[PDB]
């Protein structure tokens, strides 16, 4: 079943035994309806052709990592309707299962609906003289408006509604974008994917302003922080998001996106007593 744990902001769905071709089921098609908000995660464990009783299983859309079924109808890149979404689709060669994780961005501008179909109707198992076919499961997902824009820096110009600062990048730019945030306020940035992001996988490592811009892992500065990152989405952009909660130590750090002719620095100051 699909369950949303309101405490972890995570919706988990397991679509394996519901579509197995070895078990008997009343309904050939079952529907799940889930509503998500900004920063929620959707984790779906589903099978592959390599798992017994799922030899002819398939997903719709086939490119599940990049696409959804917009309006339960046509297969579209999720980046087009949910700007800034982050998807991963990782295979487990032991259990023959795949895990799909969708991160809703820290702000959603437009209410959206889409669906995903896990179709095992073509797989079959032989029991005695009977041939039993697998079944189908559909997930209908709804995303609400995102409440607040990210106090951050869009260096691409393509995420103007997602960030408080957004500017198209010209040659010979050398811009520094400053941000002060308190607890439970999102920051982040977007760059061209071919630009060089320094340090590696910001904010996973950052230049610590307090210690002479030395490179440090973020978790060697705070364990009261959540982050996410995508190196290259389907539109060719790099994005990173960060948020603190219940962190009392003050922080000051930065990161850079640099091409052969331009530099873009984001400088974040986290003050646990800053009031907007």
């Amino acid at each position, epitope marked *: 079943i699909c369950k949303y744990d309101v405490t972890t902001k995570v919706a988990t769905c397991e679509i394996i035994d519901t579509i197995d071709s070895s078990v008997l089921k009343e309904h050939h098609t079952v529907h799940y309806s889930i509503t998500l908000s900004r920063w929620d995660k959707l984790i779906i464990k589903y099978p592959t052709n390599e798992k017994t009783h799922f030899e002819n299983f398939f997903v719709n859309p086939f490119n599940l990592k990049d696409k959804v079924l917009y309006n339960y109808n046509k297969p579209i890149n999720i980046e087009h309707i949910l700007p800034g979404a982050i998807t991963t689709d990782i295979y487990d060669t032991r259990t023959k299962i795949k895990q799909y994780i969708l991160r809703i961005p820290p*702000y959603v*501008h437009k209410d959206i609906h889409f669906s995903l179909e896990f179709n095992n109707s073509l797989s079959l198992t032989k029991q005695n003289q009977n041939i039993i076919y697998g079944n189908v499961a559909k997930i209908f997902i709804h995303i609400n*408006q*995102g*409440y*607040k*824009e990210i*106090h951050g820096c869009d260096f691409t*110009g393509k995420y*103007s*509604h997602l960030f*408080t*600062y*957004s*500017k*198209k990048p010209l040659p010979n730019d050398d811009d520094i974008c400053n941000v002060t945030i308190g607890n439970n306020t999102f920051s982040g940035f977007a760059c061209l994917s071919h630009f060089e992001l320094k340090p590696n996988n910001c904010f996973s490592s950052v230049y610590d302003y307090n210690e002479a811009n030395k490179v440090k892992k973020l978790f060697d500065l705070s364990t009261k922080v959540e982050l996410d990152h995508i190196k290259q989405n389907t539109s060719g952009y790099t994005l990173s998001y960060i948020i603190f909660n219940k962190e009392s130590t003050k922080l000051k750090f930065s990161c850079t996106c640099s091409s052969n002719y331009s530099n873009y620095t984001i400088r974040i100051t986290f003050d646990p007593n800053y009031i907007i």
Partner: nanobody
Amino acid sequence: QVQLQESGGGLVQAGGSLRLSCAASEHTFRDYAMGWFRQAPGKEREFVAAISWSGSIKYYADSVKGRFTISRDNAKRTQYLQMSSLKPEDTAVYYCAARWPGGGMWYEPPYDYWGQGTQVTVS
């Protein structure tokens, strides 16, 4: 956001209040950052306030910080400016304006679309 129209504007005491509204009948109002400017007699038009498209992030000018409040209803496609503790220098023609984000901070000019303006007098 093509059609912007203000409502409100009159006379107040030297410590009273007034409230301006700005309406746009167009759906794309949802996508524009909203703002208020004022122009005094024979003075360059100055920035008053601005609110983001989400309605959650506001930015005020130092001249009005602490007395003026901006907000918006995206369903009705309206925005409002509650002006309290009005002062004789606050006398001006107030216009509302919308801008598509980009080119820097969201609240920073240039603003794209404008209204016709409503007069506000205090004494």
